[PDB]
Design a protein around this ligand. Structure first.
Ligand SMILES: OC[C@H]1O[C@H](O)[C@@H](O)[C@@H](O)[C@@H]1O
Ligand SMILES: OC[C@H]1O[C@H](O)[C@@H](O)[C@@H](O)[C@@H]1O
Ligand SMILES: OC[C@H]1O[C@H](O)[C@@H](O)[C@@H](O)[C@@H]1O
Ligand SMILES: OC[C@H]1O[C@H](O)[C@@H](O)[C@@H](O)[C@@H]1O
Ligand SMILES: [Ca+2]
Ligand SMILES: [Ca+2]
Ligand SMILES: [Ca+2]
Ligand SMILES: [Ca+2]
Ligand SMILES: [Mn+2]
Ligand SMILES: [Mn+2]
Ligand SMILES: [Mn+2]
Ligand SMILES: [Mn+2]
Lengths: 236, 235, 236, 232
């Protein structure tokens, strides 16, 4: 039912559904089987940054994921979002765990979209969260996601002692719908940035974090824990 | 009831409910009887601009309204919004007509809010220079509609732009806004909109307001005319 | 001897130096002979818009030029600016006329650059001109460029009665140097937008407007009227 | 001489030229003798933030200085900058030391100005490099060490020295007011680390707005903060 475009930070290689044999970033267009991936050296316990950009001139979705003093990882894919997404969307973050686990902690998240009409003048939306509060009324929290423990967004369940739980799935969507494309626009673009902390006691953490864009009424597909990243109902 | 804070552009003197004898701008804190007003030379048929600022340092809410090549009107009122509004609000525009009438056309509308923690900033900004027929980031209430020439019409207008009496409508931004937090070192907002008030009448009525409300605010029952879509009565 | 990267709005086809036989937009990298071009239906007497973008992830310099209710012209070219420009640059607008002529009037100009450090996070510069004044001290005006007349920037000479003059050249550069790239940045980007009015009595108008980026001490090359667009010392 | 309007973070009380008897923040309008001050609990060794705003509606110049999990200090003064500053200005930061000393380290600095007839300028430094070509450095100020702006002299290990004055001005002139603007405004933010082995730190950091061609006045170390030719 939902229509999803996402950039995945995939910490667990599910080779049975197309993952390369290593932690990786990917661009997902209506499937969890990424259209493109790059290798990613997830650093356990350290704060990373994801920057995701798209513009309607190049029609190229790109992401860079990095840690301080490390080489970054980057992935790109040409896709016309006009032919994939509805013109109005919501944007969000998603994460899951499975039989393996990890914290999926968001420390900050920002987003900007702009749409300039062919007839006219620009419409714009920007938000910035550098801290999250206990009752963050501009976020739609879905599943296991919580805010206001450390000023952070915990996308998946963490116990009292700080231990991440398995088989957890959670999402945060920005409250306002976003006009992501319009035929009568000369230029359209967005960017999203978040910082994250993925920690695990395991030697294999799972399953990852994504930034996504979806139909406004999107909900966690039932059973989308583990390798499905709270994003898809199946591995097709 | 709702909790409202507004800047009104009040085109019709209702001197029986404490309006001054002339079109004016005002600052409304939980009442249509403005805490402070200034005289406003409304120009029928011209596009004007309204600008509103508040910051938690001065705890002063100010507004300026102007037209090109004319002197502006300004009003300011000291108020601590921490003690008036809930922590989370929605922001909007409202307009009304009564026996007399006018177009309440919004050509653009922008808003920025920032909150700096006491242990970095959170911000929200939006900018509308065009409105579309299905503008899913706006809550439209009452008679407000979008899309005619890319404008937001707050109150009823016919197919050729002629305004109608007894109309009230509002447009709210979809996302709630964190307007204050006692743990913030500084909080500020700013709103700007451009508007076109035109009337065939000798006296146009009733005005446009920028407002901040409880998240779940709706037009109060009966609040056409002098009540500007904001308040349940004239107290 | 200057180092120039530019987007040209070329109104005059100089086919003897590689222009296509039509008004066009182009990407110039250290040469007036554009590395890539697209056809451009320049509309005499109408206010156009130019929008230029670059980011360090895609390393793609792109431009879209349009008029209300017309289809737009777009051009893109892969180039790694780190290997072209100095680390610090100035940005500007340039125009010329030759034996044929046109007004090269700029009505607005805005620019934003950002540089996020590998170690830290982000430095930014933004400027916006929606009107120009008689003594616009944050602009360096070169040659025939003037400000103030109608709140506009006139890049090339216009006479007392509004007639554009032949054999003119002038530029406007933003006063502050811009840090455009940095080896230790995780991501870098800029955008520029300007609106322009190109008007001519001439059967064929000439010669064009560019947005350019240069060494900070850049000056108009002597003799760079006409096809050289105030940018280059020769047609190489 | 120069025309200055500044917000001082004054860490040393010069009671002989009219400082109150404690660390304070002040609004200085063409004199080092603040038009208004507020007490300020400087916390030696901690990173602090200063925020400065002005808008042409209220025509009030205000500032807040604070540290995390401590009360803030605020000061305000009604002034028509139209009548004080030239139309075009530079904006900067200044600091000084004297007989007593302190680090005058700047970790970030941002600035935004707008004029509606909107024209706008914004810059943000969250890191300073060894060769920061969009800054004019004056006197002792340096950039690059740990990615910070050191306004006054410090040794290789970070020990501050006496008798130091330095400033950093943003390269581009700013159109701070225009008589035919409906609304004009600005905002400045910086974060700073004032640390000192002394039991008495001195002398302070200021954000200032000046004539375009403004330079450190001769002699203006110590209590004069790099801004003023004398204490009048
Ligand atoms: O968490 C690791 C792994 O665990 C299980 O095998 C499933 O829940 C997968 O979907 C998941 O990727
Ligand atoms: O519209 C003008 C005026 O008309 C009537 O007198 C009433 O409906 C008022 O509420 C309104 O202010
Ligand atoms: O101006 C049109 C044309 O005129 C002359 O031939 C020269 O000055 C050329 O450089 C220019 O392109
Ligand atoms: O540094 C503290 C103090 O030291 C000396 O007494 C002088 O240089 C003053 O100008 C300064 O305020
Ligand atoms: Ca996986
Ligand atoms: Ca009234
Ligand atoms: Ca040519
Ligand atoms: Ca002092
Ligand atoms: Mn994967
Ligand atoms: Mn009133
Ligand atoms: Mn060419
Ligand atoms: Mn003092």
């Amino acid at each position: 039912a939902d229509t999803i475009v996402a950039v995945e930070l995939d910490t667990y290689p599910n080779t049975d559904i197309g993952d390369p044999s290593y932690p990786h970033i990917g661009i997902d267009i209506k499937s969890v089987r990424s259209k493109k991936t790059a290798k990613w050296n997830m650093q356990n316990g350290k704060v990373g940054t994801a920057h995701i950009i798209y513009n309607s001139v190049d029609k190229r979705l790109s992401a860079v994921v990095s840690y301080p003093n490390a080489d970054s990882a980057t992935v790109s894919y040409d896709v016309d979002l006009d032919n994939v997404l509805p013109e109005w969307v919501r944007v969000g973050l998603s994460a899951s765990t499975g039989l393996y686990k990890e914290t999926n902690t968001i420390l900050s998240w920002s987003f900007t979209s702009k749409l300039k009409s062919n007839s006219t003048e620009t419409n714009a939306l920007h938000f910035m969260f550098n801290q999250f509060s206990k009752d963050q009324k501009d976020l739609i929290l879905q599943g296991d996601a919580t805010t206001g423990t450390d000023g952070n967004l915990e996308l998946t369940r963490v116990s009292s002692n700080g231990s991440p739980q398995g088989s957890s799935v959670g999402r945060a969507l920005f409250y306002a719908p976003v006009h992501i494309w319009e035929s009568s626009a000369v230029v359209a673009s967005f960017e999203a940035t978040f910082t994250f902390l993925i920690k695990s006691p395991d030697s294999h953490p799972a399953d990852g974090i994504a930034f996504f864009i979806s139909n406004i009424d999107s909900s966690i597909p039932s059973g989308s824990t583990g390798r499905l990243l709270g994003l898809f109902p199946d591995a097709n």
